[PDB]
Amino acid sequence: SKQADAYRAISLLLRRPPGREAFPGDVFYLHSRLLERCAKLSDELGGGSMTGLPIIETKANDISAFIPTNVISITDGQCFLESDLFNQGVRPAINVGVSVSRVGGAAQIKAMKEVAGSLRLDLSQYRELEAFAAFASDLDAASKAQLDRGARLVELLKQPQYSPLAVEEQVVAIFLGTQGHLD
Amino acid sequence: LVSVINEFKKGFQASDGALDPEDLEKESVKVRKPAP
Amino acid sequence: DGQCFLESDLFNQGVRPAINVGVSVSRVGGAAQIKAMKEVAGSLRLDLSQYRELEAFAAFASDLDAASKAQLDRGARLVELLKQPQYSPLAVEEQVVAIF
Amino acid sequence: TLRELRGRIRSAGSIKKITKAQELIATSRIAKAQARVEAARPYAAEITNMLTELAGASALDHPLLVERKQPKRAGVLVVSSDRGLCGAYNANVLRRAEELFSLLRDEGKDPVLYVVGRKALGYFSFRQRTVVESWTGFSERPTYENAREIADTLVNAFMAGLGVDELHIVFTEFRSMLSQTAVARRAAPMEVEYVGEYSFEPDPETLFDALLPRYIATRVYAALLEAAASESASRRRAMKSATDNADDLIKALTLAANRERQAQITQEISEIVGGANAL
Amino acid sequence: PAIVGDEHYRVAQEVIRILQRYKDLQDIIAILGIDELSEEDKQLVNRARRIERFLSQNMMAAEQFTGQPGSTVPLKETIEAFDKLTKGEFDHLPEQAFFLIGGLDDLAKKAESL
Amino acid sequence: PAIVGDEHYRVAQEVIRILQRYKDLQDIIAILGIDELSEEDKQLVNRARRIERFLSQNMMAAEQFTGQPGSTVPLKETIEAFDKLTKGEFDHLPEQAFFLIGGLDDLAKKAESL
């Protein structure tokens, strides 16, 4: 976002024509010719790769502002972080109900696929059921268990900063929840 | 002032202030004998 | 130094002059009043704004705490007290007693 | 401006979740209430059979079976919800109650009022008529222990003739999940219906004079179970309505918020480009 | 009150207060309907809907479209009607009776046909 | 929690969670009423409405705003007062008792006034 704001400053001082949100015409091309240099090369080029984590900052959680819209259209996957989930205790604040990745299972190891496969579905069912937490006596037991699983999975996904877990430890963490041992 | 307010409050004057019998239904007790 | 925000949807409901007591403030405050008025009125803005927050909150509560019911009735008394007709100025000597 | 519409959209989107949740809750509770009604029915069917076989041998001269010589005063019970969001339920009950009161006062009698459920208690406290007694905090799940006290009180007020010359109940009949109505009927004095054609210990008269109060209790209990089942069905309907109304509000607000977004962007561009063309 | 007299001004202020309280309750009315409101508010909304519909009139101009004749009511009859409406002397009539009337005798004539 | 210690960090995060939950519930409470909520949510709302007013303070420069003199509340007393609030050890005090009050000693004296 401060990249785009610097290039807008330069471009306006040079008397180039302004477009939407005062950005010059080429701001999509400015971000694109940056990001599309991230790739995985084939074996004929030595099989090296570069992975980009562009950050952007959104005003008042809108995603219809110009720079957000461009970078969402350029990138392969979008981890939305929301301040509401941050305050409700879900730290890191990943909005697992709206964040997506277009690469999907091809980036995960088999031991992670074998566990995480149902996890998105369990959290989607929990987010649907969430309103019934106030009336959980009157709820059918076959979904009362889904609510109690979902609440434990949401606790299982919290994590303290500067403490990244190696893959072999997080697979066991997700196994506890998904296989119901945590219940 | 409080004494005047309480003297005055005693002397104030506040501004203090189709169904059909055929549609009505009857509870009954039944008797297994013919009407007299 | 301060706002007397006049709001049409207070004006229509009889509160005249229509001062929105939430937003309205004076930042010189009780340095610009006579001693009697600072004694008698020395928190009245905060008490009316607290009443407007409580009146909004309790609008659909079926029952209320004893202290809540007292504050809600006291606020309706103060709002009826602050109404005033056009071209009826009050001398400060009369205003002190009215707020008393 | 856009910020109010963003807030109002989020608010409405919460209200839509909360009403849809309660619609499903009410759709469960009407099944619980129908299960309670069908579990109560096999007692009332046998008390009725026993009462009719006792009446077949009895004198039929109990006070509840004999009308007063000149009635002046009539007791009425109105039953109502303890919670809001019921929609028309309390209004239908209370409209029928007033329609009954204008029947009684058109015949010459004055009603003395007994109230079940905090909503009707709030209505008859706003309109200035006194309530003789009231009960609250069970219209969502009536138990026979409450119907015992109500039937005792009504029967004691009748048998006193302060006193009353009749007893009426106003409630709602659950005809089906999609259709129900308020109903008002006379509980006392009772009519005797002869129809075409045992040992009793110690005597048929004594048993009949003990049983009639308990028949009156089981009939008010069956009425309270009908009231609770119909209330939960009216709550379901009114909550489905509220959900549809919130969904149409989120639609209209979104369509306003988009016209505002577009207008805001077009204004911002017009201002920039006018600034550039001035230079 | 100095130009129109107190009897006009007091009625006008009472009508505006009622319509304002209705226009505030509108946000709940749109979701839950009338039934959720407390009695002190439901009493008000019932007459608000009547006062609102009663401000309609069959104008002389519209006769060329509706075919109904036009109506002129004097100020005094207007003040009396709205004073009665705000106090409640017409609350028992159905809302539909109040469209496009004119004066109080025409109100009665319409309400009798329903 | 590495800097301020885990007590401070826990109390801060519990208070923010409560106030966030209260800001989610305001839109409901304003239409359906507090009586509709779960017992646990209704309890949280009663804690939040107090916490909000206990975050207010009589400042020394606001002498001309409130007439009451100002107060300074120590960090440990602040942590202990909010810890007690979140666990409900002051839920039996009337809602107005916390407003502008400063520390726990003043809170007790103003609750004993009411």
Key structural traits:
part of a larger assembly; 6 chains; D: about 280 residues; alpha/beta; 5-stranded mixed sheet; 5 helices; 5 strands; about 65% helix; E: about 110 residues; mainly alpha; about 60% helix; globular
Topology at a glance:
The structure is cut from a larger assembly and holds 1 copy of chain A (183 residues), 2 copies of chain B, 1 copy of chain D (279 residues) and 2 copies of chain E (114 residues).
Chain A: H1 2-13, H2 27-35, H3 66-74, E1 77-78, H4 83-87, E2 100-101, H5 110-116, H6 119-129, H7 141-156, H8 167-178
Antiparallel strand pairs in A: 1-2
Helix pairs in contact in A: 2-3, 5-8, 6-7, 7-8
Chain B: H1 2-11, E1 25-31
Chain E: H1 6-32, H2 39-54, H3 63-66, H4 75-87, H5 104-113
Helix pairs in contact in E: 1-2, 1-4
PDB class: translocase
Keywords: Bedaquiline, Sirturo, TMC207, T207910, ATP synthase, mycobacteria, tuberculosis, translocase
Entry title: Cryo-EM structure of bedaquiline-free Mycobacterium smegmatis ATP synthase rotational state 2 (backbone model)
Walkthrough of the structure:
Chain A is mainly alpha-helical. Chain A contains eight helices and two strands; from the N terminus they run H-H-H-E-H-E-H-H-H-H. Helix content of chain A is 44%, strand content 2%. In chain A, strands 1-2 form a two-stranded antiparallel ribbon. Chain A is globular, with a radius of gyration of 21 Å. With 36 residues, chain B is α+β, with helices and mostly antiparallel strands. Chain B is rod-shaped. Helix content of chain B is 28%, strand content 19%. With 114 residues, chain E is an all-alpha fold. Chain E has one domain (1-114). Strand 1 (25-31) of chain B pairs parallel with strand 5 of chain D.
